[PDB]
Design a protein around this ligand. Structure first.
Ligand code: HDH
Ligand code: HDH
Lengths: 269, 268
């Protein structure tokens, strides 16, 4: 992997592995989401960030502040086949005092064709109290030197699906998968549930018949609260619609506290 | 990745990823087991095998015969850190009419030092009936051309750990993790539970205090029956001692055994 010529974006190639693919011998959306996370990490390391925290500046480490994902939005036109090389380009942008955005473009390394794109919204939070906060001028100044100054968006369109508000699924859900719990492989290097695990859990309540006859085109996921290593989750799904659309909700099995909400768009194969 | 000069083994380098590491920022044993599986696949592809079955020769495809893992044995001296390059060499050997063996050697690409080793036993099974009855004659001649003729073993020592019989854990277990179920990410390209998932499930019943203060050195796992996509598994563990443990995975309902194993851990 490497920073581009101007040092404002980062590119990395990956060979799709045998265990990374589903029934059609192409990479799963969870494999894609792990690769986006990996290229994000390699970009932060290349521009000087420490191994103590992801994209945490010197002032953030001094204040015990971290970046946390608020939303992930991925659109795939073609999933790379087993053995294929996919090239991913990533970059960051400041969004005033709201937080930061990380965008990605996925390409077929042989044809140069764009096969997918993704965007994510990150908010600042105190690591100890879990209280969200706006980005201070000192922090904004320390990371602006690594971001393009003019806007560069993966999703430019005037009213695009990446910024649409997601409603809360009402009981009863059409489909559900109950009692989902993380194992040690679902945790990251800090013993927190990996953000990609939540995508897998959302998709668990999609019926097998949709999975077998449709291709997942778009997934938008809002992150509200964390699943702890000892928590149990229920995944709920209701059809909202050639194309199939679904509304999703992940909540704690006991009290029913929301942890995530999302939408998926699928097209017939 | 590439076949070596003689074409009797295969080597491949991997850069350890951020999501592949645990709390000490080194690769998990499940990441290692996935890499062993990946280098095994790339080796089979490089010597001419097709994409519809792992190491299935022409006669095997005609008879609906597949290779299935009977046992996996892994020993790690040092887990590679996040960002490090690990080089893995793999090769296969025929074991008469019993089945086949696949061995691996893991090395630090910078120092050339051996950091781990693994060995696995594979048996033939009819894919439709699930009957183990495995033969040799035509099949053994079709794959012998890709194996070293003289024995080459990752675990040479006579009466070593990789070939030791594992007893069945007796109730009550000291520790347990109940109601484990696979999700779609646990399945392979054929909608079967990935062999590495079983390693994760075995390790789930090891207490967090052992995981936090010890390093996993050795794991030996016997595969007896598969967990289906709609099955539920209970993971049981009892200390038999360095710390040593005896393991059992069984279906949550009837208690049918799916796996048995042992782990050896050293204090950090
Ligand atoms: N592209 N589809 C996928 O990767 C997918 C992943 C997990 C599911 O439970 C369903 C679908
Ligand atoms: N080296 N340790 C490991 O990779 C490990 C993996 C999963 C566990 O539940 C416990 C330990």
């Amino acid at each position: 992997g490497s920073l581009t010529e101007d040092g404002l974006s980062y590119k990395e190639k990956f060979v799709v592995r045998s265990y990374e693919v589903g029934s059609n011998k192409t990479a799963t959306v969870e494999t894609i989401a792990n690769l986006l996370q990996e290229v994000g990490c390699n970009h932060a390391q290349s521009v000087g960030f420490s191994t103590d925290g992801f994209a945490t500046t010197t002032t953030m480490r001094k204040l015990h502040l971290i970046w946390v994902t608020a939303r992930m939005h991925i659109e795939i036109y073609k999933y790379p086949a087993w053995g294929d090389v996919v090239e991913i380009e990533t970059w960051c942008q400041s969004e005033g005092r709201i937080g930061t955005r990380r965008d990605w473009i996925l390409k077929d390394s042989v044809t140069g064709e764009v096969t997918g794109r993704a965007t994510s919204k990150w908010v600042m939070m105190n690591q100890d109290t879990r209280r969200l906060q706006k980005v201070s001028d000192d922090v904004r100044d320390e990371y602006l030197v690594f971001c393009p100054q003019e806007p560069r968006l993966a999703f430019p369109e005037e009213n695009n699906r990446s910024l649409k508000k997601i409603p809360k699924l009402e009981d009863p859900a059409q489909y559900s998968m109950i009692g989902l719990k993380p194992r040690r492989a679902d945790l990251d290097m800090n013993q927190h549930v990996n953000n990609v695990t939540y995508i897998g859990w959302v998709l668990e309540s999609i019926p097998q018949e949709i999975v077998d006859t449709h291709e997942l085109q778009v997934i938008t996921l809002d992150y509200r609260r964390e699943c702890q290593q000892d928590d149990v989750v229920d995944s709920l799904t209701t059809t909202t619609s050639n194309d199939s659309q679904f509304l999703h909700l992940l909540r704690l099995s006991g009290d029913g506290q929301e942890i995530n909400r999302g939408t998926t768009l699928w097209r017939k194969k």
